[PDB]
C-alpha cells in the first residue's frame, strides 16, 4: 500500500437486505434514490445485541406502516424502514439509546438523495432499509457511554452471525 479501494457489489433485488421481504417497493414514495456504495453504516438503538444479533433489524410495519419517506423521516410514525446513518458519531445526538451498532448492507434508500438535503433532519445524513436488515448484514456493536456520549470500545462485540460480501 497505498491502494485505491475497489467499486461495489450490485445485487438485482433493491431490498436484497430485508429482514422482510413483504416489504413492498412499489409503495415507496417519493421515487427512491437506493444507496450505491457499501461503506460502514451505523444505527443507534436501544435493543440489546442478543436480540439484534438473533433476528436482525426488522420494521415495525411493511403492511400497513408509512411508506412516504419525507413523512416517516418527519414524523416518525411506524414504517417499513429501519433508519441507519452514514455518520459514525450520529449516536452522540441520540436522547439514550444504548449501543451504535455496526452495518455492512447492501442498498437501502439514501434519504437525502431521495427527498433532499434541505429538509430539517438532513444532517442524519440517513439511509432507510426498506423491510430491514437481515442479520448477516450485522456487523457488531460497540455500547454508549451515556454521559460522556463516547463508546465503550473494549465492550464491542462481533456479530456471530456477520457475514462479510465484499
Same mark, same amino acid.
Given at each position: 500500500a497505498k491502494a485505491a479501494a475497489p467499486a461495489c457489489p450490485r445485487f438485482d433485488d433493491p431490498v436484497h437486505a430485508a429482514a422482510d421481504p413483504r416489504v413492498d417497493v412499489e409503495r415507496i414514495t417519493p421515487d427512491?434514490?437506493?444507496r450505491t456504495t457499501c461503506g460502514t453504516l451505523y444505527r443507534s438503538d436501544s435493543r440489546g445485541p442478543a436480540v439484534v444479533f438473533e433476528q436482525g433489524f426488522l420494521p415495525k410495519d411493511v403492511i400497513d406502516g408509512q411508506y412516504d419517506i419525507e413523512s416517516y423521516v418527519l414524523v416518525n410514525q411506524p414504517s417499513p424502514y429501519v433508519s441507519t446513518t452514514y455518520d459514525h *458519531?450520529?449516536?452522540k445526538t441520540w436522547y439514550k439509546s444504548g449501543y451504535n451498532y455496526y452495518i455492512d448492507a447492501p442498498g437501502g434508500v439514501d434519504v437525502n438523495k431521495t427527498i433532499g438535503d434541505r429538509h430539517k433532519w438532513? *444532517?442524519?445524513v440517513e439511509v432507510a432499509f426498506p423491510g430491514?436488515?437481515?442479520t448477516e448484514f450485522v456487523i457488531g456493536v460497540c455500547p454508549v457511554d451515556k454521559k460522556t456520549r463516547t463508546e465503550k470500545m473494549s465492550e464491542c462485540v462481533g456479530n456471530?452471525?456477520?457475514?462479510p460480501w465484499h
Open positions: 427512491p434514490v437506493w *458519531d450520529l449516536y438532513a *444532517d442524519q430491514g436488515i437481515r456471530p452471525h456477520y457475514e
